[PDB]
């Protein structure tokens, strides 16, 4: 009887931790969607900088 009650208690605790984890992974997903957008921005800006610098290199030459 006590072993089964202990098992139930552990499972209930683990459900709580996993509900917490689900909330956390949602926060992680939101953050990743934002970072993907910004990393896209970064790639575009990096390319733009490369091109602009090249244009000045040719200008100075």
């Amino acid at each position: 009887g006590s072993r089964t009650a202990e098992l139930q208690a552990e499972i209930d605790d683990t459900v709580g931790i996993m509900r917490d984890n689900i909330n956390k992974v949602a926060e992680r997903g939101e953050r990743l969607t934002s970072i993907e957008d910004k990393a896209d921005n970064l790639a575009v800006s990096a390319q733009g900088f490369k091109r602009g610098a090249n244009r000045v290199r040719k200008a100075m030459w």
């Binding site: 098992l7 683990t14 931790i17 984890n21 956390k24 992680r28 953050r31 800006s45």
Partner: protein
């Protein structure tokens, strides 16, 4: 015969073993998400800062 009682006990044994591992996994997963969340926050900020710096220099180069 005690076959069903013995199987109930044995199944509970196995459920207890797996449950122990599930709890450890849930705890470890939580810690890892905590750690990565702070890392992601920093990545986001750094990415933004770089993007701004790049636009600034691109604009400056345009005028040269």
């Amino acid at each position: 015969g005690s076959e069903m009682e013995l199987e109930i006990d044995r199944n509970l044994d196995q459920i207890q073993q797996v449950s122990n591992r599930l709890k450890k996994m849930a705890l470890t997963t939580g810690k890892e998400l905590d750690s990565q969340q702070k890392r992601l926050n920093n990545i986001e900020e750094s990415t933004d800062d770089l993007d701004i710096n790049l636009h600034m220099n691109t604009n400056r180069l345009a005028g040269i």
